[PDB]
Amino acid sequence: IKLFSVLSDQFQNNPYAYFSQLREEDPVHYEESIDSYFISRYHDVRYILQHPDIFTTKSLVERAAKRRIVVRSFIGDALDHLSPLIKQNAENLLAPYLERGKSDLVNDFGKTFAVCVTMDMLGLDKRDHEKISEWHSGVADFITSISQSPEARAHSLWCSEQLSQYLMPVIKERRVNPGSDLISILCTLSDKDILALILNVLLAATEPADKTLALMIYHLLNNPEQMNDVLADRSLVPRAIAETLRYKPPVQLIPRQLSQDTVVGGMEIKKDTIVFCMIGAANRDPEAFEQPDVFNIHREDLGIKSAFSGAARHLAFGSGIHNCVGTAFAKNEIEIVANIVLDKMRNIRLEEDFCYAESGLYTRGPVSLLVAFD
Numbered sequence: 001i002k003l004f005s006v007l008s009d010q011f012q013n014n015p016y017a018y019f020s021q022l023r024e025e026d027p028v029h030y031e032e033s034i035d036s037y038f039i040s041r042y043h044d045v046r047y048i049l050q051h052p053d054i055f056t057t058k059s060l061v062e063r064a065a066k067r068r069i070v071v072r073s074f075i076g077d078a079l080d081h082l083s084p085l086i087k088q089n090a091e092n093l094l095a096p097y098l099e100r101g102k103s104d105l106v107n108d109f110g111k112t113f114a115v116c117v118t119m120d121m122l123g124l125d126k127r128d129h130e131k132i133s134e135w136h137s138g139v140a141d142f143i144t145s146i147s148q149s150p151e152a153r154a155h156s157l158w159c160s161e162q163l164s165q166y167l168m169p170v171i172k173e174r175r176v177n178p179g180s181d182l183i184s185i186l187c188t189l190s191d192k193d194i195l196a197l198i199l200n201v202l203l204a205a206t207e208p209a210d211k212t213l214a215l216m217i218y219h220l221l222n223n224p225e226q227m228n229d230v231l232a233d234r235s236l237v238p239r240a241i242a243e244t245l246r247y248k249p250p251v252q253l254i255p256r257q258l259s260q261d262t263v264v265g266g267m268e269i270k271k272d273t274i275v276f277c278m279i280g281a282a283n284r285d286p287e288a289f290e291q292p293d294v295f296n297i298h299r300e301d302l303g304i305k306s307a308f309s310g311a312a313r314h315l316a317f318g319s320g321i322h323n324c325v326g327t328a329f330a331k332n333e334i335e336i337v338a339n340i341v342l343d344k345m346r347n348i349r350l351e352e353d354f355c356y357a358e359s360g361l362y363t364r365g366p367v368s369l370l371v372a373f374d
């Protein structure tokens with residue numbers, strides 16, 4: 001019986017083995033330790049994201065009316081000016097790995113890459129990608145964890161202290177002479193509010209991007225004919241990005257607190273309680289997608305022309321008026337790296353005896369990705 005916990009070691013070894021069980025027999029799955037309900041079905045999940053008056057949310061600031069419009073119109077104008085930067089970042093970061101013909105896309109290249117991109121977005125110095133990459137974890141670990149050793153929380157708090165002490169001077173600096181980056185622009189609306197937006201944009205643009213790339217490569221390689229497809233026609237890359245997003249969404253839950261007494265699915269839920277949209281479940285629901293547990297970049301129901309917008313078929317960006325602002329931007333970013341990886345690592349295989357693993361419950365990705373090449 002689904003009394004089973006979606007927070008168990010058992011579940012984290014493989015979320016996809018239990019989604020059917022859930023959306024079919026306990027589609028509004030209640031949790032014991034947290035006082036929250038886990039929503040399994042597609043059309044429920046979609047309705048939740050579509051209605052934020054009833055289902056409020058908060059921003060990823062936590063322990064240290066809409067402005068997204070200007071943020072989105074930054075990312076739309078900026079997207080052009082960042083393309084050679086995103087391009088250089090990839091080329092540069094791969095440079096040390098080409099001689100050996102061997103690499104770990106998650107741990108040698110991925111995280112570092114995602115960081116430098118966000119840094120260009122915020123116009124920071126890429127000499128500091130390490131400090132920033134490390135601090136970024138600490139805060140993120142805080143958000144993503146169910147519990148923390150007093151050490152880890154002591155450590156996350158530090159990362160946070162450290163980050164704002166780094167960014168805040170830069171805000172004053174640009175407040176008085178802007179440039180063509182986000183921080184400069186957000187200053188043209190309080191000092192500390194700008195710190196919050198930046199921070200949010202730092203956590204949001206960073207965690208998922210590295211993750212998806214690895215995922216896409218992995219599943220491309222695991223279906224080598226589909227790989228060869230993308231090798232011979234590169235306009236395929238988006239469908240390939242998109243189908244990875246549905247298959248194995250990097251962000252796995254999207255919270256919503258409840259503004260009222262309300263019902264969706266079987267049980268009647270009460271005021272001020274928070275729910276978790278299970279995105280994996282939704283994108284593996286037979287009711288939205290045909291042969292849902294099959295990776296196919298060529299699926300007729302992906303809806304590619306809509307895959308990266310406010311009203312897409314898959315939901316790894318969320319859905320509606322409150323979806324990931326950097327969808328346009330993410331698209332291009334992953335598009336660019338993918339092509340660069342594909343170009344530089346001629347004949348990519350998976351490493352002999354490479355056994356594959358995913359870790360994450362709130363955000364999920366490969367632990368590592370051992371590819372070999374020419």
Ligand code: HEM
Pocket residue numbers: 049057058059060061075200201204205206208209212245250251254316317318319322323324325326327329330333
């Ligand atoms: C790898 C691709 C990406 C995925 C899968 C992804 C996913 C998501 C999801 C699930 C949300 C929550 C949506 C909701 O509230 O329903 C979100 C929000 C957001 N995304 Fe992304 N995202 C991606 C890339 C990016 C990029 C490149 C940016 C660059 C600006 C970005 C900026 C944001 C921001 C600012 C939020 C607002 C959340 C908040 O702080 O209130 N995302 N994204």
Ligand SMILES: c1ccc(-n2ccnc2)cc1
Pocket residue numbers: 060140143144203204207208251362363
């Ligand atoms: C930690 C937890 C969630 C996220 N996140 C939120 C929206 N897109 C990614 C980023 C870092």
Ligand SMILES: [Mg+2]
Pocket residue numbers: 290296298299300
């Ligand atoms: Mg089909």
